[PDB]
Amino acid sequence: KTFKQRRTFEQRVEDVRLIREQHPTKIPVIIERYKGEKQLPVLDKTKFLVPDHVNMSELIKIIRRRLQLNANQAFFLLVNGHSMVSVSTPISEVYESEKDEDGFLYMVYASQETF
Ligand SMILES: NC(=S)Nc1ccccc1OC(F)(F)F
Numbered sequence: 001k002t003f004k005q006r007r008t009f010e011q012r013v014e015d016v017r018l019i020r021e022q023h024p025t026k027i028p029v030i031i032e033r034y035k036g037e038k039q040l041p042v043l044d045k046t047k048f049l050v051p052d053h054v055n056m057s058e059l060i061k062i063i064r065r066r067l068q069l070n071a072n073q074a075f076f077l078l079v080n081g082h083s084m085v086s087v088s089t090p091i092s093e094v095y096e097s098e099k100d101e102d103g104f105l106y107m108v109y110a111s112q113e114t115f
């Protein structure tokens with residue numbers, strides 16, 4: 001069901017290596033709906049190439065636009081299992097400290113801050 005489940009550590013590593021080769025300026029991001037989530041829809045896909053200059057605040061806006069949410073629907077985004085300490089950090093910086101050992105940056109979203 002979840003991404004890590006569907007692809008071997010070997011396969012995830014090689015896809016990150018291909019994104020480096022073909023999209024050197026993009027951060028490889030996995031974005032998944034919390035398996036408990038009731039309100040928010042599921043995304044059209046799982047794997048995103050994010051321009052390395054966008055900050056977490058702009059990534060949240062991007063995903064809210066992708067889900068086509070409205071002003072008073074809630075949205076929380078966990079990175080590498082935990083709350084973001086700041087939304088102003090460039091995703092290049094966030095990647096370097098929060099990346100998985102496979103090379104992806106893992107994110108999960110929910111309507112509840114209590115995931
Ligand atoms: N659409 C995605 S997933 N990423 C993206 C972002 C900005 C420009 C182009 C993009 O696609 C590309 F990475 F495939 F090039």
Ligand SMILES: [Cl-]
Nearest residue numbers: 023024025026
């Ligand atoms: Cl590129």
